[PDB]
Symmetry: D3
Subunit: 123 residues, 6 copies
């Protein structure tokens, strides 16, 4: 499970303020082949949508899409005007109370994932 | 390895006071699908037996059975008078000295496990 | 993935005569460590129910339960009046037309499973 | 390894007429949860390019892209004008003489893959 | 599970003429990355010993050792006087009657293995 | 993934002082079957070589060989003048700055590995 195109997804973090929709999501991305990538992708909104592109940060050139249904992750990354990588992952997690409300919840991943990057056709 | 019927077993803990039989066993059980289960199952006895049902706690409605031979775990849970789940797992571990005796040992799991629940026929 | 108490489950087969309930179910069990076990477990009923013990065959001293819900299998072997082992698996499968009436379906496994037997406490 | 949005990819097949580019590629997709999907996706071109969408077949409403570099597969299913799913796999394979001219090669998968579909955002 | 130095081991075959020691052993090695390697490694002796190097065949420049204890395989390829690679696998198998005398047994693999080659230091 | 011959490799640590060659390497080895092995194997040199035997410590009776190319590990252990075990593993990792130089780097493993021991023929 190493390789120049394999990444370790880890440290998944979610905030469900009314116990339903996320208002915050993030995770960490690490190199696997002794490379140097150690990046925490993260987004916030008042009511985040399933199956919607969000940026991971300004100048990250990365976007993700999340489906809370089955905790599925879509990951995309522009590398040039010609190369784009994409990857799918699943991110197991549990929730515990957040105390910033009655129905406030904190979601933490309970397992790491290892994605393989594929090149997205320019179409 | 997510799902509404998948659980993460973790934080395995054992006490072998004379270096043989356990006198204490426990582990943690977490949800995997963003659910809320975060429970530490645990039992104690002067000399615990292999292949014997033990409660995980009062009002847990859960019992487990352990086989120290191959570190195998049986997990059972009453959900109603009609539904009972069971699962099998294996729990790798090592021991280190406990210092509360010459042949005292502490056992800690070295890997998480992911069980799938099946329904136990009422027979 | 080998061992004295590890078995391969394969060749899963069921019939849905009206394309709903099974009226026949079966699979094969092989040894894994150079043992000699190569046993085909199978059962029939007019309409089979999920989560109900069925015999694997006369003088097999084995029983199983199946949940078509999540393709969960529960396996039980009586070795003696004093020793019983159990195990759990998931059996991925697909369906297709059986040819005996338009609503007739045949289900086949599409993936091997490897089970680990644990001792069931007596009482 | 089962689910409503889990598919088995198997029976991978490609032709390298001069033993370099593919001029034909295909594989099979089956359901995993007792579903009925058993679809063979295949495409041809004079010389196929890596990282380019190809149709799986007329009225399949499916497309795929393949990278012979790392045997990466990208799969896309249009379910409606409003819903599209995607998935990623790696398809281990080997080559051998095809017999139609000395430089002719045939590639076969040597391992099944199991994909998980996620929803692709619209826009 | 692909790579330039990843091989599939399959089609394991041994003969226990008296149902104890092997007097014949073999398996197949295939490439995994669209390579062309499809080599069948096999050896015979009057009575074969565990944990002893055997040749895979004349001018194969390969050797293996097998432990019927835990079905462990050790594989060695001499590429040149300067480069040797090694790898390790476990080969799940079962036995059955061979038909050539009552004590005659045939062993077959029941699961593929995927090995990773590493360089063996010289000296 | 337990067994009397299975070990957990963990806590991989590497030092690449000029950003290339390692000058230090180490990792931890733990029992998996409730045994007592908890050992940190480690070596240092001004410029460490790929594919070279290094001791894990005085009186460890263990040597390893590393290939930084694909982060592959060879592990060997003398148990008597008659028994020697060997195992192969792969050890995913990433690097971050070390600050003891411009091109100084610290490598930490990002995933555990589970090796199976095989017996090395005496030849």
């Amino acid at each position: 499970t190493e390789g120049d195109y394999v990444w370790k997804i880890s440290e998944f973090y979610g905030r469900k303020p009314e116990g339903t929709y996320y208002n915050s999501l993030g995770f960490n991305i690490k190199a696997t082949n002794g490379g140097t990538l150690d990046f925490t992708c993260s987004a916030q909104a008042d009511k985040m949508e399933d199956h919607k592109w969000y940026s991971c940060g300004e100048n990250s050139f990365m976007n993700f899409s999340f489906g809370s249904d089955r905790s599925g992750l879509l990951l995309k990354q522009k590398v040039s005007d010609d190369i784009t990588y994409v990857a799918t992952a699943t991110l197991p997690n549990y929730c515990r109370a957040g105390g910033n409300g009655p129905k406030d919840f904190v979601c933490q991943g309970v397992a790491d994932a290892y994605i393989t990057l594929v090149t997205l056709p320019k179409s």
